[PDB]
Ligand binder design. Structure first.
Ligand SMILES: [Zn+2]
Ligand SMILES: [Zn+2]
Ligand SMILES: [Zn+2]
Lengths: 105, 814, 71, 397, 131
RNA sequence: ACAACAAGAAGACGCGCAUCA
RNA sequence: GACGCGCAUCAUA
């Protein structure tokens, strides 16, 4: 996600697994969050696919209902041949939102 | 002192206050962490943490500030490791998942920052403590500090802790450390599998029950971590397990069964069968057990044994089921929840192998039970079975029983359960076109449920009809579908929005599944009735209504007159205020959907007039709508109106039109080669140093256009924009520099790396530092992509007295 | 910090990169490019009367330390 | 101002030549590779002619080409390593007469680069794994298996990176139903770029490492590291298991060295020189390419020098160790890039510049008048070139 | 002082050591014959009209995505190996339509609103006229 | 036991101006 | 450096 600069990608050797996308983010690009012209399929490394992490969403982490795709611009720029797009950082925004949601109810 | 008072004031600012004050205090403490010092700061922050009456909010802020100050002090926290650990350890046993994960992360960071020997010596006296809670916390700490810095950095310590003879507490703690490392690591212990198996194997024949049980649990954890590979490492462990199966009873028997069940899948087919036979010889007599945890363990063992490919189906159907269906299918099993899920999963995977018919035929009669929980359990069972195996094997004698059972289950309900509707939809879809002779019963039941009992099951009935419209259409039926549609029509005006959304979704599904020209109520009679619904503030009703409006506009447009579309537009301009992304996207799409049918003259004027909201949310949606309508229509009929609006002296309008141009160029793609000349003077004027936002938007436009027009050979006008993009690199704002970098990388593929290299070779070795940093960053960006293409564009550099910088291989002449 | 592509990759420079390092990196890249292509190798082996194996062996030797000794 | 590209003649420069049973029948075929065109051709034992049956353009530089088969299989699958950042597996369908892609795995950026694998490609002779490697810092291993549907599969790549290493050649070592082994000529240069005195450039010998693939452990670990006294160029795989000892042959300047891991000592054998050579004595002698004829009874090797002399290398071995290396002058042919020794005595010579020749092996040179050579002779050898009298020309391309 | 513009760029992929514009067969138009260092001979042919050029461009665009190359290498990226392609249509890709699957050939034909018998004749006419 | 979820509302930034030490 | 105000960016949720 380009909106949040603090997010860090896994950036490892992609395996043969297939990424998944939930209903909240269905047609978004895994890199630039675009909405036009899906091009290729997203692969992830075996570390991101083990036990409870199998079938989870790539960006946020919800249940997987659709496959992840690269847009045409990312394919032209060859940004897909980098690694798995799975985000390993939990994110300071989500935990903080949960923290001031829990106290208020 | 003064420093202590300052730390008191900033700590009070961090603890309580407005978010701006807290973030300012955090940024200043991160800026001045080194100057403040570590000693007094830690001696000041620890007493607040150790207080048992601390609220979670200030505890989280204190942990965050500790994390912020930890990485700045690379080596100054060595003497404070013990005093920080003795306060921070209890945070890894709380039930809060986020708290546990941030505690694990902070302990990993502390282990990385500190040294191995000092912390090892710190935690030496924690092994022999008599408290079990502190031993468990120490085991978790050892696991996380072993995940940090690597396993081999701690491997020799494992031998020392596991070979202790004075007491069994040290050995138990070592085995716990091993199992926690296996659990927390995942599949990263595969290279270090044997080094752990050999050290842990000796504990299976000890005289203490605790050490044997913990060793069995750790072996099970290791087998779980190394699921597909590693039988050669465990080949020396099997025989003690079989020897201990018969001798041990109780908790140790449970641990041994769990371990052996985990190791079964790792073997080959012949060995798997040979050993699962012996496992079953005790499993059959072991199904009878009073404890629920042992029932869960044996269910997991059965699941894992059935999952093995080496066990053939005839043995399964001859042995396992006759006791399974007689012992594990009772009311008490459905009473619990862990047993609920475990039994459901085991039954599903058993049906995946032995056959769906055999499983289903003995549980269809269970749908007539008076208990609601047991009916829910069996309904989930068939729903999951038919989700995977379909309904191609079920026979008519079984199909009618299943239909009767599901109808009985749906007819009476104590509360509202979505599992009933989900299962009914799954069974109906799996049956396909063979549910045709039962359609009138379903229609009568859904009508009866919809017509009465005060809007409690009406929304579920709407969901059911929305799910079954497809099957009723595929079963060659239209008349009762139209009757249901018209019935929903007089049932459209409800006060409750929750049922209104479901009814609107049902109507939308009916419109999707059947033709628009064959709908029983004329299309002209819906939109006047549907327009007041758009003013509702509820989310689901708005979603369903906007989806229905978009579908009608895309499909039914010749019937609808061009008078109410204006009112729909003026209502959608207000509906754009909605928070959810789906509603905004649907409204933006339906703008273009209706402007395809209606000439883009009044639509553009309405959108352009609402570009001065002063709210950022509305302008982005409006400009995306402008882009999508421009893409849908011919771009030459929408450009001059957009350009004429640029002369307004409002900066918001200029930003909006520039963003619309960017989005339009992104959408059209290869069609931008004909209109590239038109926007060149506008981009030239915008790129001038007048404001940062305008330059950023112009850079985005340049990037998108350059990416779109690649492959056509139009660099004559693209090269002119580089002379204006290049001077904008020297900026400090992250957004503008990101936009400029993106524009440069987009232009790199369109113009060729030669021009970029020529531009970069000007001040690559400039005497200053910041310009060198910028140029080197740009050069690295160009170098990562299309590295091979830079060979032919490298400049010639003459060699000096000492070195040879001339590439003589390219000077050969034939 | 999304600069992971620059640090992990080999050959990327920075402010404190000397001229000799850049020159030797580009020389090694040029040698690899010569070796990869076939028509360039044919041109090199036709310009001087040698064999493809001999040219490849010489290119292997020249990759140890080009541009002379460092300063 | 719009042009259109037409092509009249296709490229005829052979770069890589492989042989095997690609169609699945009992007749051998040769898959030659041009710069960017993949071609399939088979010889006719009846009329002694060569005809092309397939020609497809791949639109890219083919940097490597290998063939292999699965355990117990009857068909050969072609593995192609190109300038792109991916590896593909091809299968030939005789009925369709087209190439069908079986698998496609991407592991890096496209284009000829330095740290992108594709230059060196080695396969397990048994057919259980394949290896791909780059010039520097990057090696990758792919494990191949088959499912119950009798279809070839592939697993995730395994990292075998090593910083500051210049790989000269990668070849697979044949073992008998054991962990796969790969031999490479690694070479470090970290110290050579640190000392400005200049002696680091010299006295920097290259090693010969062995890589072990642990199927149970699913990782690759370095086993041994043996420095070499001189510089070598490429390696040859000696068949192992039940047919011959397991080992590799190292070709260098004026010398050939047999080397094996364990208790096997090193054997050094000089290369014979032409009698009354007019060349500069300072010039050395190296090998360009080699072949292998794995006959059921006994196996030998064929090698070619810079001048085109063909030698016949024969290994005499004990129960476990090898005694000596025997060399024998076979014939003289124009310098070629690769040889393909087919069944029924067919020799294919793909010249690097000029026409291509097909030779029929009429005699094996048994009990020849000219003497042989061996490493047991103390102290340099000489031989007299002569007409062929051992191969008969049949077809010319 | 006075720079010169470039009106054509391409990447044959092989080293070229000869260029000559002449007529090959009697009764035909001129062409730019070039020979490479690998043994291939090729010519460059200008179009005769604009509809034919548009049809060739559409065929190339359809076959770029619908018929990917054998080794999984992008055709546009390969032809733009050093410099972007300028006003050149690749005939090697366009002439691969004959070996394509019959159903895919049909789909392409009704995407172009033509017939494979007419497409083959159109493809062969440009080769016959200039060679 | 290592186990991910519900809408009283929040995450990263910047440019300008008033007062005080 | 401290107490404040206004404007504006990221199809931010
Ligand atoms: Zn990953
Ligand atoms: Zn998601
Ligand atoms: Zn993208």
């Amino acid at each position: 996600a380009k909106h949040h600069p603090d997010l860090i990608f896994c950036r490892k050797q992609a395996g043969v697994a297939i990424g998944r996308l939930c209903e909240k983010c269905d047609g978004k690009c895994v890199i630039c969050d675009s909405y036009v012209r899906p091009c290729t399929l997203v692969r992830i490394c075996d570390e991101c696919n083990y036990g409870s992490y199998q079938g989870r969403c790539v960006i946020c982490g919800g249940p997987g209902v659709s496959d992840a795709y690269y847009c045409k611009e990312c394919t032209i720029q060859e940004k897909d041949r980098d690694g798995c797009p799975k985000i390993v950082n939990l994110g300071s925004s989500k935990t903080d939102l949960f923290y001031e949601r829990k106290k208020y109810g | 002192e003064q420093k202590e008072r300052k730390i008191m004031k900033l700590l009070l600012k961090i603890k309580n206050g407005t978010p701006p004050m807290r973030k300012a205090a955090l940024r200043q403490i991160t800026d001045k962490a080194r100057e403040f010092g570590a000693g007094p700061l830690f001696n000041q922050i620890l007493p607040l943490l150790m207080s048992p009456t601390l609220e979670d909010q200030e505890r989280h802020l204190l942990v965050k500030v500790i994390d912020r100050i930890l990485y700045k002090l690379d080596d100054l926290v060595r003497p404070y490791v013990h005093k920080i650990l003795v306060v921070i350890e209890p945070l890894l046993i709380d039930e809060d998942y986020y708290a546990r994960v941030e505690g694990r992360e902070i302990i990993s960071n502390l282990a990385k920052a500190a040294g191995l020997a000092t912390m090892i010596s710190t935690m030496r006296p924690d092994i022999d403590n008599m408290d079990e809670y502190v031993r468990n916390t120490t085991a978790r700490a050892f696991a996380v500090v072993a995940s940090a810095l690597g396993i081999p950095s701690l491997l020799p310590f494992l031998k020392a802790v596991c070979k202790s003879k004075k007491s069994w507490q040290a050995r138990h703690t070592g085995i716990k450390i091993v199992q926690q490392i296996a659990i927390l690591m995942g599949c990263a212990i595969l290279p270090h599998l044997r080094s752990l198996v050999e050290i842990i194997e000796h504990g299976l024949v000890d005289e203490q029950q605790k050490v044997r049980t913990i060793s069995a649990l750790a072996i099970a954890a290791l087998a779980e971590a190394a699921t597909p590979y590693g039988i050669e490492s465990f080949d020396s462990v099997l025989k003690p397990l079989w020897k201990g199966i018969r001798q041990h009873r109780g908790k140790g028997l449970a641990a041994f069964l769990k371990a052996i069940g985990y190791l079964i899948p790792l073997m080959d087919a012949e060995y798997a069968n040979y050993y699962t036979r012996e496992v079953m010889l005790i499993l059959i007599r072991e199904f009878q057990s009073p404890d629920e945890e042992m029932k869960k363990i044996v269910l997991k063992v059965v699941k894992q044994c059935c999952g093995t490919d080496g066990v053939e189906a005839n043995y399964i159907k001859t042995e396992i089921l006759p006791p399974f269906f007689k012992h594990f299918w009772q009311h008490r099993m459905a009473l619990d929840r862990r047993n609920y899920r475990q039994l459901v999963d085991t039954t599903v995977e058993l049906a995946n192998k032995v056959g769906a018919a055999e499983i289903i035929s003995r549980i269809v009669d269970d749908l007539k039970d008076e208990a609601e929980q047991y009916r829910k359990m069996v309904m989930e069972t068939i729903e999951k079975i038919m989700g995977n195996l379909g309904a191609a094997d079920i026979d008519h004698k079984l199909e009618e029983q299943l239909i009767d059972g599901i109808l009985y289950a749906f007819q009476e309900q104590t509360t509202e359960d979505s599992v009933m509707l989900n299962g009914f939809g799954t069974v109906v879809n799996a049956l396909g076109k063979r549910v045709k002779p039962y359609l009138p019963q379903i229609c009568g039941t859904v009508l009866w449920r919809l017509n009465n009992k005060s809007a409690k099951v009406r929304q579920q009935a709407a969901d059911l009809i929305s799910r079954t419209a497809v099957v009723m259409k595929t079963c060659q039926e239209e008349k009762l579908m139209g009757h249901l549609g018209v019935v929903l029509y007089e049932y459209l005006g409800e006060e409750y929005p929750e049922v209104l959304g479901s009814i609107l979704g049902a109507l939308k599904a009916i419109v999707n599944v059947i033709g628009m020209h064959k709908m029983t109520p004329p299309i002209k009679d819906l939109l006047p009735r549907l327009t007041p619904i758009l003013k509702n503030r509820h989310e689901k009703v708005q979603e369903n209504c906007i989806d229905l409006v978009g579908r009608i506009a895309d499909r039914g447009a010749e019937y609808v007159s061009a008078r109410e579309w204006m009112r729909i537009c003026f209502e959608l301009l207000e509906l754009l205020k909605a928070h959810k992304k789906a509603i905004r996207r649907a409204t933006v799409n339906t703008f273009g959907y209706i402007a395809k049918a209606i000439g883009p003259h009044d639509v553009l004027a309405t959108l352009l007039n609402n570009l001065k909201v002063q709210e950022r949310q509305n302008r982005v949606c409006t400009t995306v709508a402008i882009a999508i309508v421009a893409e849908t229509c011919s771009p030459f009929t929408v450009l001059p109106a957009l350009m004429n609006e640029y002369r307004v002296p409002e900066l918001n309008v200029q930003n909006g039109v520039l963003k619309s141009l960017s989005f339009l160029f992104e959408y059209i793609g290869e069609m931008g080669k004909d209109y590239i000349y038109a926007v060149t003077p506008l981009l030239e004027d915008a790129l001038m140093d007048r404001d940062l936002v305008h330059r950023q938007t112009a850079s985005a436009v340049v990037q998108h256009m350059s990416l779109g027009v690649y492959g056509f050979g139009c660099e004559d006008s693209l090269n002119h924009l580089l002379n204006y993009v290049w001077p904008n690199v020297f900026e400090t704002s992250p957004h503008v520099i990101q936009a400029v970098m993106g524009a440069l990388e987009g232009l790199r593929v369109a113009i060729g790396p030669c021009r970029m290299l020529q531009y970069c070779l000007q001040g690559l070795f400039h005497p200053a530092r910041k310009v060198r940093d910028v140029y080197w960053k740009i050069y690295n960006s160009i170098y990562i992509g299309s590295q091979d293409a830079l060979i032919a564009h490298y400049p010639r550099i003459y060699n000096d007295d000492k070195n040879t910088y001339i590439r003589y291989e390219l000077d050969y002449i034939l | 910090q999304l600069e992971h592509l620059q640090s992990k990759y080999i050959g990327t420079g920075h402010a404190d990169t000397t001229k000799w390092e850049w020159l030797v990196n580009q020389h090694r890249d040029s040698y690899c490019s010569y070796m990869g292509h076939f028509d360039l190798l044919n041109y090199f082996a036709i310009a001087e009367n040698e064999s493809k194996a001999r040219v490849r062996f010489n290119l292997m030797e020249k990759m140890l330390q080009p541009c002379g000794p460092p300063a | 101002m719009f042009l259109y590209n037409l092509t009249l003649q296709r490229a005829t420069g052979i770069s890589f030549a492989i042989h095997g049973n690609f169609s699945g029948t009992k007749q051998q075929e040769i898959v030659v590779s041009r710069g960017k065109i993949l071609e399939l051709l088979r010889p006719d034992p009846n009329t002694g002619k060569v005809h092309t049956l397939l020609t497809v353009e791949v639109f890219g530089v083919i940097r490597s080409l290998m063939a292999f088969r699965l355990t117990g299989g009857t068909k050969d699958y072609i593995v192609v390593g190109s300038d792109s950042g991916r590896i593909v597996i091809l299968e030939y369908q005789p009925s369709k007469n087209m190439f069908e892609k079986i698998h496609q795995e991407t592991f890096g950026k496209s284009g000829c680069r330095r740290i992108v694998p594709g230059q060196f490609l080695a396969v397990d002779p048994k057919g259980r794994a394949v290896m791909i490697s780059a010039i520097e810092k990057q090696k990758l291993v792919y494990i191949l298996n088959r499912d119950a549907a009798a279809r070839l599969t592939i697993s995730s790549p395994l990292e075998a990176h090593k910083a500051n290493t210049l790989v000269y050649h990668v070849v697979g070592v044949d073992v008998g139903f054991e962990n796969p082994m790969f031999a490479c000529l690694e070479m470090d240069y970290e110290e050579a770029d640190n000392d400005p005195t200049g002696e680091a450039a010299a006295n920097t010998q290259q090693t010969l490492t062995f890589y072990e693939l642990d199927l149970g452990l699913n990782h690759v670990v370095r086993k041994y590291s043996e420095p070499l006294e001189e510089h070598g160029n490429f390696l040859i795989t000696v068949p192992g298991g039940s047919d011959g000892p397991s080992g590799v042959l190292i070709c260098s300047e004026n010398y050939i060295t047999y080397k094996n891991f364990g208790d096997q000592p090193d054997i050094r054998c000089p290369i014979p020189r032409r009698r009354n050579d007019l060349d500069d004595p300072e010039r050395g002698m190296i090998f360009v390419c080699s072949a292998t004829h794995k006959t059921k009874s006994m196996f030998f090797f064929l090698a070619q020098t810079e001048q085109g002399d063909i030698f016949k290398i024969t290994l005499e071995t004990d129960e476990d160790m090898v005694t000596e290396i025997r060399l024998k002058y076979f014939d003289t042919v124009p310098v070629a890039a690769a040889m393909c020794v087919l069944k029924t005595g067919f020799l294919f010579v793909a010249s690097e510049f000029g026409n291509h020749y097909l030779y029929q092996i009429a005699h094996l040179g048994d009990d020849d008048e000219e003497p042989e050579f061996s490493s047991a002779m103390p102290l340099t050898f000489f031989f007299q070139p002569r007409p062929l009298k051992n191969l008969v020309l049949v077809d010319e391309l | 002082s006075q720079k010169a513009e470039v009106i054509m760029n391409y990447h044959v992929g092989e080293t070229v050591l000869s260029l000559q514009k002449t007529t090959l067969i009697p009764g035909g138009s001129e062409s730019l014959v070039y020979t490479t260092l690998s043994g291939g001979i090729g010519i460059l042919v200008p179009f005769t009209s604009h509809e034919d050029h548009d049809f060739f461009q559409h065929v190339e665009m359809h076959l770029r995505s619908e018929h990917p190359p054998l080794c999984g290498r992008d055709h546009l990226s390969f032809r733009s190996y050093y410099f972007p392609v300028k006003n050149v249509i690749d005939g090697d890709l366009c002439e691969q339509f004959n070996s394509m699957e019959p159903n895919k050939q049909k789909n392409v034909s009704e995407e172009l609103d033509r017939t494979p018998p007419e497409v083959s004749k159109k493809l062969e006419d440009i080769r016959t006229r200039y060679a």
